[PDB]
Write a protein that binds this DNA or RNA. Structure first.
Lengths: 173, 46
RNA sequence: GAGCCGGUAGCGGGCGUGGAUCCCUGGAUGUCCGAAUGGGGGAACCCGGCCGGCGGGAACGCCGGUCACCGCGCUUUUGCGCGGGGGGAACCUGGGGAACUGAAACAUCUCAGUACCCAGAGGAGAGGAAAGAGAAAUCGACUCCCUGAGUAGCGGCGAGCG
RNA sequence: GUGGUUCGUGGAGCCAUGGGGGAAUCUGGGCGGACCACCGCCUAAGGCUAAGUACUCCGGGUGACCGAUAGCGCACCAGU
RNA sequence: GCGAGCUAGCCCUGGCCAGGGUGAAGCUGGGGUGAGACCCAGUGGAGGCCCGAACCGGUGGGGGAUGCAAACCCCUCGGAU
RNA sequence: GCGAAUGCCGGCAUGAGUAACGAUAAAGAGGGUGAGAAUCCCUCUCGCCGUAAGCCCAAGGGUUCCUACGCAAUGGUCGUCAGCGUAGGGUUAGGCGGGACCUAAGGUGAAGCCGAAAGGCGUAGCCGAAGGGCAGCCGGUUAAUAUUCCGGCCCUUCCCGCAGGUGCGAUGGGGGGACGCUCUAGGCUAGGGGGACCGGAGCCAUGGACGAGCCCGGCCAGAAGCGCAGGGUGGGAGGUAGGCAAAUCCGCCUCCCAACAAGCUCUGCGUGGUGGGGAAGCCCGUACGGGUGACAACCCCCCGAAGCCAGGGAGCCAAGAAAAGCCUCUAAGCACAACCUGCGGGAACCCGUACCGCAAACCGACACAGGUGGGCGGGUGCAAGAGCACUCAGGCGCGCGGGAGAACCCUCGCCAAGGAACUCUGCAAGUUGGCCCCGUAACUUCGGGAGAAGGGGUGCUCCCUGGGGUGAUGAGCCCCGGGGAGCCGCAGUGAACAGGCUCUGGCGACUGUUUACCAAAAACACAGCUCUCUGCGAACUCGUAAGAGGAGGUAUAGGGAGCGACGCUUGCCCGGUGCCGGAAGGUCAAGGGGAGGGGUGCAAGCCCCGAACCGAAGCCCCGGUGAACGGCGGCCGUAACUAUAACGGUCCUAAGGUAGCGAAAUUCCUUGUCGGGUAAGUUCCGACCUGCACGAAAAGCGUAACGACCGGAGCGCUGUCUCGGCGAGGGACCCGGUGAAAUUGAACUGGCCGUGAAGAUGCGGCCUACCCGUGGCAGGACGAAAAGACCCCGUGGAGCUUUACUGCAGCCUGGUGUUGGCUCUUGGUCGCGGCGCGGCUGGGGGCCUAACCCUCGGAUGGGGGGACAGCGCUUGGCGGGCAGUUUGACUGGGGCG
């Protein structure tokens, strides 16, 4: 419903309980309200799995318990993640419903290796974080916009195209 | 038929009105232009 | 110096040589807008603290006065007391700044540092006692008029500029 | 690397500066047009300075200047 | 310098589509197999979906040509959550 | 010193007493006033609305509104009429709307951030609305106002007092106001309908009936008290590793009461009691009638919302805005005086109202059949319904009237007999048009193509029968069959609104969207595919540096793109070009860096030219590259009794067209040749295929459905046509009233055959030839419109293009700067193939790191990057993205030549 919310933990020792299935319409991410100890909440990432009955978190400590997330430092090798913590705390550093996250495919000193979900590879840094678990996007792909144009229903630009025009109009155009 | 005249108090006013002109460099300009220059009254005055 | 209540000549009424109309200059009022500046705003409207009479408050309580924008100095103390800004036909220097058109094209060039826009000074600014000019060991502020001179000279050495 | 100057890249200086190096306090330090010797001038890298020229909104004067389609377009409940 | 009270858009915020028709997901029940696939029947009510007013339009013909009008009148037509 | 510039300005004639009265929703009659009335007032027939030609709220316009006088001009005629003139007068609110409250976009904007200056952005706060919020309603009352004035009924906020009560006491917090769409239960006013059941004013004329007969109405609003009706939340303790920066609030975990319980916000009764209340109505206009007095009646059953309770419930996806009130509390003061309550007295503003308002008062310059947003829109009939025909309330007859009825244009109605042959074309029109039953083909992505195609039904009468709402169900109402019998007309959706169907082909799939005043299409758009730049502080787009956008997106993503479902399938060539990679080698800018020469120099010196070598991207050179640009051979021979071919011979090219298709909308020789369709068919449709010049990605062959697309054919039907011929309403014609307009030197302007500058009323010869007019018919006056748009000419202009010229924007790029330390290293060089050293100086690799930047993540500290780079200066380069010029003459037309 035209809004944002959470995206980056950094208060821990906190109790992570899988709020609920609030599959969400606004970023290809499907998240559920994450119930913290105090009671303070957050429509959190959609890293598939972690059943309703919440039951997680993270921590400077550990707990690969699927989903959840800590610094690079605190992370296995051969592991699949998201909550792409690029720079030191820059919260998320990639993978948006981009299921196929990154896989600490080898780390090095204040530098941890990452399979570039998108489609390449290089390294991050020290404390830098990132929570494993999948994504959530049920292949958020495909699906037919049949005899109409989902598009429009887009609210998402018919910013339509052209290319053939009659003129000689717009940038590199 | 829809000409182009349908005036709109709110509108026309707003849009044009002592102020504005003022607020502006330009506006201001001509304005004090008109002023002397011509005499008369002015927009909003309208 | 003896007539008047403006252009209105008209009705109805009136001031005046124990110096009226009007001519001057310095005044006190100067409602609302407008740099506006207390606050808001489609100008000429609608809103707020302090003082204020106290006011009809017939045995019941309000306008008036006021006041305060913000950038400037700095007696800094908690900052109290001075300047500004908005104009303005034309003219002034700085800041920025163009094609036409001429060259019988047009890229150099010209129109020009013009036209315009901007800022700002003034009643005038501009500028102004020389690391100046030139060469007779000669001259001396800056400015402006005539002259130097359409010369010395700049140049697709062309139009021109000069 | 541009300016202004008569100088449109030129044998091309002075003064003014966009970037980078970054001297001297009187035998110092620019200058007289590449530069150099000698001569001659001047003393910078802060400031103020009325008067002599310009301009007419204003007021006056004067006209081989006009007369209501001329003159400012507008001689009077016109920049309406 | 002047303009989106022209028009093309885009942001914000309300209003508006008389009637009718077609009958997919589903859920209920029944159906030979292990469960099922899957069938059928009921319910059900989607779709830039159909038939059509207002409303949006303005092909196809008719008039009009110093018109009613610097684009309009007439018959006709498409769209119609 | 002026005809004279389609000259400017002013007047004034033309056509011309012909053309027009702004919708073919028509009028006509009696009286009245007046100088004078088709055009005014009263009255009586008649016609048009009626979803309007209704009242209403807005926006816009602002006295246009009323009343008494008046018509000079505006009223396209009059005119005593006016939305025209002068004068006077009219619109009042604690509760309606705007503010004295709230914010999203957006706009402003102290601080903050960047510009040559003007300026740009912009936090918080403020501006900003029929979005949020907020305390009333019905009747009366003037010439006009009215939810404001009357009155009857219903309230709210502030203040002072006292009475009672309780930690009151910010707005900081928390809930909180807060919402999508499609759909639907339960209940109820609005609204409608039958009542012959109640009240009353009268009638019946006519043949008939005084009868459940005709005609009016039988309602509107309300303290709470009160039962149908729902409508919203649960209730205690404790822990509060403690949040929502600060504690009791709410958020989160644990144990008990965890219902149809109790809670708190709209409709019915009603009913306090008021009003209305029509038909009156004795005084009074018995008439511009009605102002104001009987009594009214005040009742029942029926239908029933597309938004009344309500923030419903159910489903769905594209998954639905922020600040007053309520409770928690710090500062803080009350805490015998702070807030809640009760009663009594006291206070309540600023500006808006008239009338118009699907409009002569609003935009179209005009009383112009143009547009303009919301509210039920009364009924009867039609399956339903703001569609339709008639009409209710209310509105109006178009502001020019008579008179003839000729041609002729308009709109409309009809036909025999034929029934498209008319013609480019069934363009038009006419067929057909509504609901029920029967019945439905090729093909299919099985949904559809079906309303397909093709019939048959419908009207009013009586009979017996079955159903769902009807509080049981018993004058009441509805959906409905049923089946039987029967009546009438040419006809029985009787009128009115209402598809022609089929057979085929081509393109594009499809609903679309678009060139406002020609073109709605095979044009774009697409859902869908493929290459593809991009790791964030993205990449591209605006921007002078900030900055926004992007995106609070993050590779199932964001931008660049050529095609444009789905199916089937996309082959061959990287020699040139763009690009991606390479960077060893050639080249080469600024620059370092020295041989050497030069000028002056008595001399130390003092200026230049300077070159060997080191030196950047670029370009040259190697490769990779096709849903990147682009291209994808020629002729001679041969079984072929005749013809490419199965094969063979070759010259050039980078290979040298593949699968599908084919005279297609790419095939001019052509109406190509064969076939079908026909009385013949240069359109079609099938097939061949020597494809003048298809071809897979600006796709290629096909493809159900789909199209106001285009083309081909058959049934149906009609004046489209064989000529039509009749008619109805409207101008045209005669009357009265009014009364333009472009063009025009001027003119009393005939035919001829000849002529002239070679298409003459005006010149020659001749022949007919009285003067004027009106209703017409087009030929000539080279008629009107417009100093040709097709043409060439001006070394005119303006837009797009690339290996045109140049230059800038941006981008890449060497050295230089605020760009600091530490170490690892190889190269040059001159000196003393060499090695040792030496100054020189060049390359480069590293965490750091103190600039710089960024970073943030809750503070100024940490973190990351870091000598980068941003960014300044010079270098060089790409560079049609843009800016400015240019691209000759001849020419027995411009060009090509």
């Amino acid at each position: 419903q035209y809004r944002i919310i959470d995206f980056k933990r950094d208060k821990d020792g906190i109790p992570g309980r899988v709020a609920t299935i609030e599959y969400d319409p606004n970023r290809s991410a499907n998240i559920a309200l994450i119930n913290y100890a105090d009671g303070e909440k957050r429509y959190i990432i959609a890293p598939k799995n972690l059943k309703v009955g919440m039951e997680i978190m993270s921590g400077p400590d550990a707990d690969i318990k699927i989903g959840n997330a800590l610094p690079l430092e605190n992370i296995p090798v051969g592991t699949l993640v998201h909550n792409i913590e690029l720079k030191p705390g820059r919260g998320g550093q990639l993978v948006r419903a981009a299921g196929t996250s990154a896989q600490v495919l080898g780390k090095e000193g204040k530098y941890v290796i990452v399979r570039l979900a998108s489609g390449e590879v290089r390294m991050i840094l020290g404390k830098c974080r990132a929570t494993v678990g999948e994504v959530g996007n049920g292949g958020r792909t495909d699906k037919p916009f049949v005899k109409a144009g989902n598009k429009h229903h887009k609210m998402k630009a018919p910013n339509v195209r052209g290319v053939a025009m009659n003129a000689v109009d717009h940038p590199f155009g | 038929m829809k000409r182009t005249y349908q005036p709109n108090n709110r509108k026309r006013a707003k849009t044009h009105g002592f102020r504005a002109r003022m607020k502006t460099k330009s506006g201001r300009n001509i304005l004090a232009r008109r002023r002397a220059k011509g005499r008369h009254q002015l927009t909003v005055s309208d």
